[PDB]
Amino acid sequence: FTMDHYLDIRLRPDPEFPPAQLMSVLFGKLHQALVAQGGDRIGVSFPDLDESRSRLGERLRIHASADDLRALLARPWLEGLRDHLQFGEPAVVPHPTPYRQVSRVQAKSNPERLRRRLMRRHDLSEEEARKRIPDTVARALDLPFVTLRSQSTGQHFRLFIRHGPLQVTAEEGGFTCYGLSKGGFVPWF
Amino acid sequence: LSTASVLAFERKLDPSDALMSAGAWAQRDASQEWPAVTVREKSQTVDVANLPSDADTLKVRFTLRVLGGAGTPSACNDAAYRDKLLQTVATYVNDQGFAELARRYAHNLANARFLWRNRVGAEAVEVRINHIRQGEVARAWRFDALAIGLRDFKADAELDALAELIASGLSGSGHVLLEVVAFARIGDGQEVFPSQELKTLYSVRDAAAIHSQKIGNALRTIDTWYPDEDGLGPIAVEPYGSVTSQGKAYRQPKQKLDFYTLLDNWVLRDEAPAVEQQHYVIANLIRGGVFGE
């Protein structure tokens, strides 16, 4: 009733398995696919496949109702792989209630950028640009890693995804997707 | 009676270092003056090899010799073990010749698996294999590398013709040298993935390239007869068939499906099944290695 279709993809094993890079190419091809389609009406999740909360799953599930799904990256609208997945076909969802959330976050682990932005913003001096308020004392960080090289005009990002409150508490009908490529309230298993 | 103390199998299916060069799609015909991609450095500091900004297509190129006479070892210590090994490979090819292994090698040359990381994000790959007879093109192929799968082995006329040519080279009935050139649509200014050295990418003469052993590892992934659950697919034929990046070792010697137990049963006491493990042990000695006491 929220977005009632799912694709239980299973990335097969392969003697080349950089998971950051496999999910990088997959999420990047998905980015290309949905910016070619166009629309803030799509869902993406990652079911309970992260055993620890360090790794990330070897699976995926896309949540678009009928038309965006069948027209977007699917059996039509080429993936360009069709061999490394051998995936299936979607169908209607059951009735769970884990409160349905996923999230994107990014942190700061390179104060060179911040000091350079200070130097650029109002022509800061080197001594204060060195000790006004960097975070040289401690380097923040985030656990779940995916690489996702730049869509264009850039270089290797390192994107972080935190599963939101997945509590068996309630449910609500909210927006379709936040960010750009990531649904909002999404059914979870 | 026993195995020799030293046993050395020389390499068959001899590859070269795959020289890489950028270019544009729909210019694959006159692709001889194409500029080779070089390695640059950036910010401790690492190396990176991209394409030029006016090039949306990578082209790798390597020459593959196939040798033939794969059951003849280059070093032994007793004549009786060499005679028994020659008899076992001879009755292997007299029961069935190189028809399954040559078909799977023609598959691994058809789908561009020697594109290791460059294949997985490619829009369209075309492989061109030219059989160089004297110094010119005798037979030329043009394979859709993405239409031919990585885990399923199709049937085709041109692919079985390439399988027959690799079979004729592997039996010894002809000299086979193949110029293999793969055009992969990756994109304008995208990143290629050459073989990394001891982060320093490998180069020859101001030109980023893939190692010869990485190309030899990629066209060797034909092993589909092993006690795994269905879903892994083909792996490369190493003895104690390993994936060291995954940290797992299929055909570990507690299970009786490794190369050494199947060899010392298939030779010293005449024990192997009909089609599968014979193909595995013959492909493993096609790879070559150091065996013994």
CSV table of C-alpha atoms in Angstrom, one decimal:
chain,number,residue,atom,x,y,z
A,1,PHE,CA,0.0,0.0,0.0
A,2,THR,CA,3.1,2.2,0.4
A,3,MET,CA,4.9,1.1,-2.8
A,4,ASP,CA,3.7,-2.4,-3.4
A,5,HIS,CA,6.4,-4.0,-5.6
A,6,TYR,CA,9.8,-5.4,-4.9
A,7,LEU,CA,12.8,-7.1,-6.7
A,8,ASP,CA,14.6,-9.5,-4.5
A,9,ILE,CA,17.9,-9.2,-6.5
A,10,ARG,CA,20.7,-11.4,-5.4
A,11,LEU,CA,24.2,-10.5,-6.6
A,12,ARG,CA,25.8,-13.9,-7.3
A,13,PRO,CA,29.3,-14.7,-6.2
A,14,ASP,CA,32.1,-14.0,-8.5
A,15,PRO,CA,35.9,-14.3,-8.2
A,16,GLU,CA,36.0,-10.5,-8.6
A,17,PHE,CA,34.0,-9.2,-5.6
A,18,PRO,CA,34.8,-5.6,-4.6
A,19,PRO,CA,31.4,-5.0,-3.0
A,20,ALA,CA,32.0,-1.3,-2.8
A,21,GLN,CA,32.7,-1.3,-6.5
A,22,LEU,CA,29.9,-3.8,-7.5
A,23,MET,CA,27.3,-1.8,-5.6
A,24,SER,CA,29.1,1.3,-7.0
A,25,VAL,CA,28.5,0.3,-10.6
A,26,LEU,CA,25.0,-0.9,-9.8
A,27,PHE,CA,23.9,2.2,-7.9
A,28,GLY,CA,25.6,4.3,-10.6
A,29,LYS,CA,23.8,2.6,-13.4
A,30,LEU,CA,20.6,3.0,-11.4
A,31,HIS,CA,21.4,6.7,-11.1
A,32,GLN,CA,21.9,6.9,-14.9
A,33,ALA,CA,18.7,4.9,-15.4
A,34,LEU,CA,16.5,7.1,-13.2
A,35,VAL,CA,17.9,10.4,-14.4
A,36,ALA,CA,17.2,9.2,-17.9
A,37,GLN,CA,13.7,8.2,-16.8
A,38,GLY,CA,13.2,11.3,-14.6
A,39,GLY,CA,10.9,11.6,-11.6
A,40,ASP,CA,11.0,11.7,-7.8
A,41,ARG,CA,8.8,8.6,-7.6
A,42,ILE,CA,11.0,5.5,-6.8
A,43,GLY,CA,12.2,3.5,-3.9
A,44,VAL,CA,15.4,1.8,-3.0
A,45,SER,CA,16.2,-0.2,0.2
A,46,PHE,CA,18.7,-2.8,1.5
A,47,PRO,CA,17.0,-5.6,3.5
A,48,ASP,CA,18.5,-7.2,6.7
A,49,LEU,CA,21.5,-8.6,4.9
A,50,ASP,CA,24.1,-6.5,6.8
A,51,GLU,CA,24.9,-9.1,9.5
A,52,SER,CA,27.2,-6.8,11.4
A,53,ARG,CA,26.3,-3.1,10.8
A,54,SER,CA,29.7,-2.7,9.0
A,55,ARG,CA,29.1,-4.8,5.8
A,56,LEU,CA,26.2,-4.1,3.4
A,57,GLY,CA,24.0,-6.6,1.8
A,58,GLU,CA,24.5,-8.7,-1.3
A,59,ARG,CA,20.9,-7.9,-2.3
A,60,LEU,CA,18.6,-5.0,-3.2
A,61,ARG,CA,14.9,-4.1,-3.6
A,62,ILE,CA,13.5,-1.4,-5.8
A,63,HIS,CA,10.0,0.0,-4.9
A,64,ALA,CA,8.2,1.6,-7.8
A,65,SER,CA,4.5,0.9,-8.3
A,66,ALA,CA,3.9,-0.2,-11.9
A,67,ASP,CA,4.9,2.1,-14.7
A,68,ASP,CA,8.1,3.7,-13.4
A,69,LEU,CA,9.2,0.2,-12.5
A,70,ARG,CA,8.4,-1.5,-15.8
A,71,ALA,CA,9.9,1.4,-17.8
A,72,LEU,CA,13.0,2.0,-15.6
A,73,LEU,CA,16.0,-0.4,-15.2
A,74,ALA,CA,14.4,-3.8,-15.4
A,75,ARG,CA,14.1,-6.5,-18.0
A,76,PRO,CA,13.6,-3.6,-20.4
A,77,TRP,CA,15.6,-0.4,-20.4
A,78,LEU,CA,19.0,-2.2,-20.5
A,79,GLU,CA,21.1,-2.8,-17.4
A,80,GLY,CA,24.1,-3.8,-19.6
A,81,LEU,CA,24.9,-6.8,-17.4
A,82,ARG,CA,22.2,-9.5,-17.7
A,83,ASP,CA,24.8,-12.2,-16.6
A,84,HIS,CA,26.2,-11.2,-13.2
A,85,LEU,CA,22.8,-11.1,-11.6
A,86,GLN,CA,20.4,-13.5,-13.4
A,87,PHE,CA,17.7,-11.9,-11.3
A,88,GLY,CA,14.0,-12.5,-11.2
A,89,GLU,CA,10.7,-10.5,-11.5
A,90,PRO,CA,8.6,-8.5,-9.0
A,91,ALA,CA,5.2,-8.9,-7.4
A,92,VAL,CA,2.9,-7.6,-4.7
A,93,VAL,CA,4.1,-7.0,-1.2
A,94,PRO,CA,2.9,-8.5,2.1
A,95,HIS,CA,1.8,-6.5,5.2
A,96,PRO,CA,4.7,-5.9,7.6
A,97,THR,CA,5.2,-2.8,9.9
A,98,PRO,CA,8.9,-2.0,10.7
A,99,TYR,CA,8.2,1.8,10.3
A,100,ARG,CA,9.8,1.8,6.9
A,101,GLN,CA,12.9,4.1,6.7
A,102,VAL,CA,16.3,4.5,5.2
A,103,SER,CA,18.7,7.4,5.2
A,104,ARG,CA,21.7,9.1,3.6
A,105,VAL,CA,24.5,10.8,5.5
A,106,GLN,CA,28.0,12.2,4.9
A,107,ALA,CA,30.7,13.3,7.3
A,108,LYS,CA,33.9,15.2,7.5
A,109,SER,CA,37.3,13.5,7.4
A,110,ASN,CA,39.4,15.9,5.4
A,111,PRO,CA,39.7,19.4,7.0
A,112,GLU,CA,41.8,20.6,4.1
A,113,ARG,CA,38.5,21.3,2.3
A,114,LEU,CA,37.1,23.3,5.3
A,115,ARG,CA,40.3,25.3,5.7
A,116,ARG,CA,40.4,26.0,2.0
A,117,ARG,CA,36.8,27.2,2.1
A,118,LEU,CA,37.7,29.5,5.0
A,119,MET,CA,40.6,30.9,3.0
A,120,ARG,CA,38.2,31.4,0.0
A,121,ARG,CA,35.2,32.7,1.9
A,122,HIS,CA,36.5,36.0,3.4
A,123,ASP,CA,40.3,35.7,2.8
A,124,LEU,CA,41.3,34.1,6.1
A,125,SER,CA,44.9,34.1,7.4
A,126,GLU,CA,47.1,31.1,7.5
A,127,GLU,CA,47.4,31.0,11.3
A,128,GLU,CA,43.6,31.1,11.9
A,129,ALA,CA,43.0,28.9,8.9
A,130,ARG,CA,45.3,26.5,10.8
A,131,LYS,CA,43.6,26.9,14.2
A,132,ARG,CA,40.3,28.8,14.0
A,133,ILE,CA,38.2,25.7,14.1
A,134,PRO,CA,39.4,22.8,12.0
A,135,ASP,CA,38.7,19.2,13.1
A,136,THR,CA,42.4,18.1,12.9
A,137,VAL,CA,42.1,16.8,16.5
A,138,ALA,CA,39.7,14.0,15.4
A,139,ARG,CA,38.6,12.5,12.1
A,140,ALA,CA,34.9,11.7,11.9
A,141,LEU,CA,33.8,8.6,10.0
A,142,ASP,CA,30.9,6.3,9.0
A,143,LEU,CA,30.7,2.6,8.7
A,144,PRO,CA,28.5,1.4,5.7
A,145,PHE,CA,30.6,2.1,2.6
A,146,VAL,CA,29.9,2.3,-1.1
A,147,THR,CA,32.3,4.0,-3.6
A,148,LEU,CA,30.2,5.6,-6.3
A,149,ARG,CA,32.7,7.4,-8.5
A,150,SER,CA,31.4,10.7,-9.7
A,151,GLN,CA,28.5,10.9,-12.1
A,152,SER,CA,30.6,13.5,-14.0
A,153,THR,CA,33.0,16.3,-13.3
A,154,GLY,CA,34.6,14.8,-10.1
A,155,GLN,CA,36.3,11.8,-8.7
A,156,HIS,CA,35.8,9.0,-6.2
A,157,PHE,CA,33.2,9.7,-3.6
A,158,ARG,CA,32.7,7.4,-0.6
A,159,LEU,CA,28.9,7.4,0.1
A,160,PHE,CA,27.4,6.3,3.4
A,161,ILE,CA,23.9,4.9,4.0
A,162,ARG,CA,22.3,4.5,7.4
A,163,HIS,CA,19.2,2.4,7.8
A,164,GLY,CA,16.8,4.7,9.7
A,165,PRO,CA,14.4,3.8,12.5
A,166,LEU,CA,13.4,0.2,11.5
A,167,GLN,CA,11.3,-0.2,14.7
A,168,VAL,CA,8.1,-2.2,14.8
A,169,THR,CA,6.2,0.8,16.0
A,170,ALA,CA,3.8,2.3,13.3
A,171,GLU,CA,3.6,3.4,9.7
A,172,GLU,CA,2.8,6.5,7.7
A,173,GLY,CA,2.1,7.6,4.2
A,174,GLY,CA,4.9,10.1,3.4
A,175,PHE,CA,6.8,11.4,0.4
A,176,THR,CA,8.2,9.1,-2.4
A,177,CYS,CA,11.9,9.8,-2.3
A,178,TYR,CA,14.5,12.1,-0.7
A,179,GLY,CA,17.9,12.9,-1.9
A,180,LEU,CA,17.9,12.0,-5.6
A,181,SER,CA,17.9,8.2,-5.9
A,182,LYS,CA,16.5,6.9,-2.7
A,183,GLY,CA,12.9,6.4,-1.5
A,184,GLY,CA,11.5,7.7,1.7
A,185,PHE,CA,9.1,5.4,3.6
A,186,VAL,CA,9.9,2.1,2.1
A,187,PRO,CA,8.7,-1.4,3.1
A,188,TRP,CA,11.3,-3.5,4.9
A,189,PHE,CA,11.6,-7.2,5.8
B,1,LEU,CA,54.4,-46.6,-9.3
B,2,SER,CA,54.9,-43.2,-7.8
B,3,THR,CA,55.1,-39.5,-8.8
B,4,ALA,CA,58.3,-37.8,-9.8
B,5,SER,CA,60.1,-35.6,-7.4
B,6,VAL,CA,60.1,-32.7,-9.9
B,7,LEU,CA,57.3,-32.2,-12.5
B,8,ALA,CA,57.0,-29.0,-14.6
B,9,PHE,CA,54.3,-28.3,-17.1
B,10,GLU,CA,55.0,-25.4,-19.4
B,11,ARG,CA,52.3,-22.8,-20.2
B,12,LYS,CA,49.8,-23.3,-23.0
B,13,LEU,CA,47.5,-20.6,-24.3
B,14,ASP,CA,50.4,-18.1,-24.1
B,15,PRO,CA,49.1,-14.5,-23.8
B,16,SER,CA,50.8,-11.1,-24.0
B,17,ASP,CA,50.6,-7.9,-22.0
B,18,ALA,CA,47.3,-6.3,-23.1
B,19,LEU,CA,48.2,-2.9,-24.5
B,20,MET,CA,45.5,-0.4,-23.9
B,21,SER,CA,44.6,2.6,-26.1
B,22,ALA,CA,41.7,5.0,-26.1
B,23,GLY,CA,39.5,5.9,-29.1
B,24,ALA,CA,36.0,6.5,-30.3
B,25,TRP,CA,33.2,4.1,-31.1
B,26,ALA,CA,32.4,3.4,-34.8
B,27,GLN,CA,36.2,3.9,-35.5
B,28,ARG,CA,37.2,0.3,-34.7
B,29,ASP,CA,38.0,-0.5,-38.3
B,30,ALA,CA,40.8,2.0,-38.7
B,31,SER,CA,42.0,1.6,-35.1
B,32,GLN,CA,45.8,1.4,-35.6
B,33,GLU,CA,47.0,4.9,-34.8
B,34,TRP,CA,45.0,5.0,-31.6
B,35,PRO,CA,46.9,6.8,-28.7
B,36,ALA,CA,47.8,4.6,-25.8
B,37,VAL,CA,46.5,5.6,-22.4
B,38,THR,CA,49.1,6.6,-19.8
B,39,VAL,CA,49.2,6.6,-16.0
B,40,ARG,CA,49.1,9.9,-14.2
B,41,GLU,CA,49.5,10.7,-10.5
B,42,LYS,CA,47.3,12.7,-8.1
B,43,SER,CA,46.7,13.3,-4.4
B,44,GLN,CA,49.7,9.4,0.2
B,45,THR,CA,49.6,10.1,-3.5
B,46,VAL,CA,48.2,7.5,-5.9
B,47,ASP,CA,48.1,6.7,-9.6
B,48,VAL,CA,45.1,6.8,-11.9
B,49,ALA,CA,44.7,6.0,-15.6
B,50,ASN,CA,41.7,7.6,-17.4
B,51,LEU,CA,40.9,8.1,-21.0
B,52,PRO,CA,41.4,11.3,-23.0
B,53,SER,CA,38.3,13.5,-22.9
B,54,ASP,CA,37.6,13.1,-26.6
B,55,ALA,CA,37.5,9.3,-26.3
B,56,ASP,CA,34.5,7.2,-25.2
B,57,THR,CA,35.9,3.7,-26.0
B,58,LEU,CA,38.7,1.6,-24.6
B,59,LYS,CA,40.6,-0.8,-26.8
B,60,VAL,CA,42.8,-3.5,-25.4
B,61,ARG,CA,45.0,-5.7,-27.6
B,62,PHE,CA,47.0,-8.8,-27.0
B,63,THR,CA,48.4,-11.6,-29.0
B,64,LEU,CA,47.6,-15.1,-27.8
B,65,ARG,CA,49.7,-18.1,-29.0
B,66,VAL,CA,48.3,-21.5,-28.4
B,67,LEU,CA,50.9,-24.3,-28.3
B,68,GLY,CA,49.6,-27.8,-28.3
B,69,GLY,CA,50.9,-31.0,-26.8
B,70,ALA,CA,49.7,-30.0,-23.4
B,71,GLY,CA,50.1,-33.5,-21.9
B,72,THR,CA,53.9,-33.5,-22.4
B,73,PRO,CA,55.7,-32.3,-19.3
B,74,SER,CA,58.9,-30.3,-19.6
B,75,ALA,CA,60.6,-31.9,-16.6
B,76,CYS,CA,60.3,-35.2,-14.7
B,77,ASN,CA,62.5,-37.6,-12.7
B,78,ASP,CA,61.3,-41.0,-13.8
B,79,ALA,CA,60.4,-42.2,-17.3
B,80,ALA,CA,57.6,-44.5,-16.1
B,81,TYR,CA,55.5,-41.6,-14.6
B,82,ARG,CA,55.9,-39.6,-17.8
B,83,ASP,CA,54.8,-42.6,-19.9
B,84,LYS,CA,51.8,-43.1,-17.6
B,85,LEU,CA,50.9,-39.4,-17.8
B,86,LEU,CA,51.2,-39.4,-21.6
B,87,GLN,CA,49.0,-42.6,-21.8
B,88,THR,CA,46.3,-41.0,-19.6
B,89,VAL,CA,46.2,-37.7,-21.6
B,90,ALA,CA,46.4,-39.8,-24.8
B,91,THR,CA,43.4,-42.0,-23.8
B,92,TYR,CA,41.7,-38.7,-22.7
B,93,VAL,CA,41.9,-37.2,-26.2
B,94,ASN,CA,41.1,-40.6,-27.8
B,95,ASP,CA,37.9,-40.9,-25.7
B,96,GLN,CA,37.1,-37.3,-26.5
B,97,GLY,CA,39.3,-34.6,-27.9
B,98,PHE,CA,39.5,-30.9,-27.0
B,99,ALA,CA,35.9,-30.2,-27.8
B,100,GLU,CA,34.5,-29.0,-24.4
B,101,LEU,CA,37.7,-27.2,-23.2
B,102,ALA,CA,38.2,-25.5,-26.6
B,103,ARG,CA,34.6,-24.5,-26.6
B,104,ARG,CA,34.9,-22.9,-23.2
B,105,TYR,CA,38.2,-21.2,-24.1
B,106,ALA,CA,36.4,-19.8,-27.2
B,107,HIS,CA,33.6,-18.7,-24.9
B,108,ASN,CA,36.1,-16.9,-22.6
B,109,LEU,CA,37.6,-15.2,-25.6
B,110,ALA,CA,34.1,-14.5,-27.0
B,111,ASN,CA,32.8,-12.7,-23.9
B,112,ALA,CA,35.6,-10.2,-22.9
B,113,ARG,CA,36.4,-11.6,-19.5
B,114,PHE,CA,40.0,-10.5,-20.0
B,115,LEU,CA,38.4,-7.1,-19.5
B,116,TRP,CA,38.6,-7.7,-15.7
B,117,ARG,CA,37.0,-4.6,-14.2
B,118,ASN,CA,36.4,-2.6,-17.4
B,119,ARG,CA,33.8,-5.1,-18.5
B,120,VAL,CA,31.3,-4.7,-15.6
B,121,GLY,CA,30.4,-1.2,-16.5
B,122,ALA,CA,30.5,-1.3,-20.2
B,123,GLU,CA,27.6,-0.4,-22.5
B,124,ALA,CA,28.8,-2.6,-25.4
B,125,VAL,CA,31.8,-4.8,-26.0
B,126,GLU,CA,33.0,-6.2,-29.3
B,127,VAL,CA,35.9,-8.7,-29.5
B,128,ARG,CA,37.8,-9.1,-32.8
B,129,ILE,CA,40.0,-12.1,-33.1
B,130,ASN,CA,42.3,-12.4,-36.2
B,131,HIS,CA,44.1,-15.7,-36.8
B,132,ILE,CA,47.4,-14.5,-38.2
B,133,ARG,CA,48.5,-17.2,-40.7
B,134,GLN,CA,51.8,-15.8,-42.0
B,135,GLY,CA,51.7,-12.1,-41.2
B,136,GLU,CA,48.2,-11.3,-42.4
B,137,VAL,CA,44.6,-12.0,-41.5
B,138,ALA,CA,43.4,-15.5,-42.4
B,139,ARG,CA,40.1,-15.7,-40.5
B,140,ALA,CA,38.6,-12.8,-38.6
B,141,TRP,CA,35.8,-13.0,-36.0
B,142,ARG,CA,33.5,-10.3,-34.6
B,143,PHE,CA,31.9,-11.4,-31.3
B,144,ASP,CA,29.3,-9.6,-29.2
B,145,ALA,CA,30.9,-10.1,-25.8
B,146,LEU,CA,27.8,-9.0,-23.8
B,147,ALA,CA,25.3,-11.1,-25.6
B,148,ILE,CA,27.4,-14.2,-24.9
B,149,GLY,CA,27.1,-14.8,-21.2
B,150,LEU,CA,29.6,-15.2,-18.4
B,151,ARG,CA,28.0,-18.2,-16.7
B,152,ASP,CA,26.2,-19.9,-19.5
B,153,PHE,CA,27.9,-21.4,-22.6
B,154,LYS,CA,25.8,-20.9,-25.8
B,155,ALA,CA,26.0,-22.7,-29.1
B,156,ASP,CA,26.9,-20.7,-32.3
B,157,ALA,CA,28.4,-21.3,-35.7
B,158,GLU,CA,31.2,-18.7,-35.5
B,159,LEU,CA,32.0,-19.6,-31.8
B,160,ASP,CA,32.2,-23.3,-32.7
B,161,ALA,CA,34.5,-22.3,-35.6
B,162,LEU,CA,36.7,-20.5,-33.2
B,163,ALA,CA,36.5,-23.5,-30.8
B,164,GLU,CA,37.6,-25.8,-33.7
B,165,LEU,CA,40.5,-23.5,-34.5
B,166,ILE,CA,41.6,-23.4,-30.9
B,167,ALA,CA,41.1,-27.2,-30.8
B,168,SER,CA,43.3,-27.6,-33.9
B,169,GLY,CA,46.0,-25.5,-32.3
B,170,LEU,CA,45.7,-27.4,-29.0
B,171,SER,CA,46.0,-30.9,-30.6
B,172,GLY,CA,49.0,-29.8,-32.6
B,173,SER,CA,47.6,-29.9,-36.1
B,174,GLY,CA,48.4,-26.2,-36.7
B,175,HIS,CA,50.2,-23.1,-35.4
B,176,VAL,CA,47.6,-20.7,-33.9
B,177,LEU,CA,48.4,-17.1,-33.1
B,178,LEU,CA,45.4,-14.8,-32.5
B,179,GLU,CA,45.4,-11.0,-32.4
B,180,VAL,CA,42.6,-10.4,-29.8
B,181,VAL,CA,41.4,-6.7,-29.7
B,182,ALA,CA,38.5,-5.7,-27.6
B,183,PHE,CA,36.6,-2.5,-27.9
B,184,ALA,CA,34.6,-1.5,-24.8
B,185,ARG,CA,32.3,1.5,-24.6
B,186,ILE,CA,33.0,2.9,-21.2
B,187,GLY,CA,32.5,6.6,-21.6
B,188,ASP,CA,34.1,10.0,-22.1
B,189,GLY,CA,37.0,10.4,-19.7
B,190,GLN,CA,36.1,7.3,-17.7
B,191,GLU,CA,38.6,5.3,-15.7
B,192,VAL,CA,40.3,2.1,-16.9
B,193,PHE,CA,41.6,-0.6,-14.5
B,194,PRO,CA,45.0,-1.9,-15.5
B,195,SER,CA,46.9,-4.4,-13.4
B,196,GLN,CA,48.4,-2.8,-10.2
B,197,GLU,CA,52.0,-3.5,-9.4
B,198,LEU,CA,53.6,-4.0,-5.9
B,199,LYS,CA,49.3,2.3,-5.7
B,200,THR,CA,51.3,2.1,-8.9
B,201,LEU,CA,49.7,0.9,-12.1
B,202,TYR,CA,51.7,-1.3,-14.5
B,203,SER,CA,53.1,0.2,-17.7
B,204,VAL,CA,55.5,-0.8,-20.5
B,205,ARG,CA,56.5,2.3,-22.6
B,206,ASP,CA,54.4,5.3,-21.4
B,207,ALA,CA,51.3,3.0,-21.9
B,208,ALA,CA,49.1,1.5,-19.3
B,209,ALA,CA,48.6,-2.2,-19.7
B,210,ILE,CA,47.2,-5.4,-18.1
B,211,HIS,CA,49.6,-8.1,-17.0
B,212,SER,CA,49.9,-11.2,-19.1
B,213,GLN,CA,49.1,-13.5,-16.1
B,214,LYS,CA,45.8,-11.5,-15.4
B,215,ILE,CA,44.7,-12.2,-19.0
B,216,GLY,CA,45.8,-15.8,-18.7
B,217,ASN,CA,43.8,-16.0,-15.4
B,218,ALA,CA,40.7,-14.5,-17.1
B,219,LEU,CA,40.4,-16.8,-20.1
B,220,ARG,CA,41.0,-19.8,-17.8
B,221,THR,CA,37.8,-19.4,-15.8
B,222,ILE,CA,36.1,-22.6,-17.1
B,223,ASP,CA,35.8,-24.7,-14.0
B,224,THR,CA,32.1,-25.5,-13.4
B,225,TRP,CA,32.5,-29.1,-12.0
B,226,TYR,CA,33.0,-28.7,-8.3
B,227,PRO,CA,30.9,-29.4,-5.2
B,228,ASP,CA,29.7,-25.8,-4.6
B,229,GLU,CA,26.1,-24.7,-4.3
B,230,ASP,CA,24.8,-23.6,-7.7
B,231,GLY,CA,25.2,-19.8,-8.0
B,232,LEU,CA,29.0,-19.3,-8.0
B,233,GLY,CA,29.6,-20.2,-11.6
B,234,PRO,CA,32.9,-20.7,-13.4
B,235,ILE,CA,36.2,-20.2,-11.5
B,236,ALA,CA,39.7,-20.4,-12.8
B,237,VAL,CA,41.4,-23.8,-12.8
B,238,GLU,CA,44.0,-23.7,-10.0
B,239,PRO,CA,45.0,-26.7,-8.1
B,240,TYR,CA,43.2,-26.5,-4.8
B,241,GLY,CA,40.8,-24.2,-6.6
B,242,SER,CA,41.2,-20.9,-4.8
B,243,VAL,CA,39.7,-17.5,-4.6
B,244,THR,CA,42.2,-15.6,-2.4
B,245,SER,CA,40.4,-12.3,-2.7
B,246,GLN,CA,37.3,-14.1,-1.3
B,247,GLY,CA,39.4,-16.0,1.2
B,248,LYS,CA,37.8,-19.3,0.2
B,249,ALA,CA,39.3,-22.5,-1.3
B,250,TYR,CA,37.0,-24.7,-3.3
B,251,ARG,CA,38.2,-28.3,-3.8
B,252,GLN,CA,40.1,-28.3,-0.6
B,253,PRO,CA,42.0,-31.6,-0.1
B,254,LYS,CA,39.7,-33.0,2.6
B,255,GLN,CA,37.1,-33.3,-0.2
B,256,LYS,CA,38.4,-35.6,-2.9
B,257,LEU,CA,38.0,-33.2,-5.8
B,258,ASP,CA,41.3,-31.2,-5.9
B,259,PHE,CA,43.8,-31.4,-8.8
B,260,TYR,CA,46.3,-33.6,-7.0
B,261,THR,CA,44.0,-36.3,-5.7
B,262,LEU,CA,42.2,-36.5,-9.1
B,263,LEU,CA,45.6,-36.7,-10.9
B,264,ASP,CA,47.0,-39.4,-8.6
B,265,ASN,CA,43.8,-41.3,-9.0
B,266,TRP,CA,43.3,-40.7,-12.7
B,267,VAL,CA,47.0,-41.7,-13.5
B,268,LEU,CA,48.4,-44.0,-10.8
B,269,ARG,CA,45.3,-46.1,-10.3
B,270,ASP,CA,43.0,-45.1,-13.2
B,271,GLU,CA,40.2,-43.4,-11.3
B,272,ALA,CA,38.2,-40.3,-12.5
B,273,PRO,CA,34.6,-39.8,-13.7
B,274,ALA,CA,33.4,-39.6,-17.2
B,275,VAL,CA,33.5,-36.0,-18.5
B,276,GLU,CA,33.8,-33.4,-15.7
B,277,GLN,CA,36.9,-34.0,-13.6
B,278,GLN,CA,38.9,-35.2,-16.6
B,279,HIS,CA,38.2,-31.8,-18.2
B,280,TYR,CA,39.2,-30.1,-15.0
B,281,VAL,CA,42.5,-32.0,-14.6
B,282,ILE,CA,43.3,-31.5,-18.4
B,283,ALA,CA,42.6,-27.8,-18.2
B,284,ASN,CA,44.8,-27.6,-15.0
B,285,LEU,CA,47.7,-29.2,-16.8
B,286,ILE,CA,46.9,-26.8,-19.8
B,287,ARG,CA,47.6,-24.0,-17.3
B,288,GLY,CA,50.8,-25.6,-16.2
B,289,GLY,CA,52.6,-25.6,-12.8
B,290,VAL,CA,55.1,-27.2,-10.4
B,291,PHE,CA,54.1,-30.6,-9.0
B,292,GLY,CA,56.0,-33.4,-7.3
B,293,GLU,CA,56.9,-34.9,-4.0
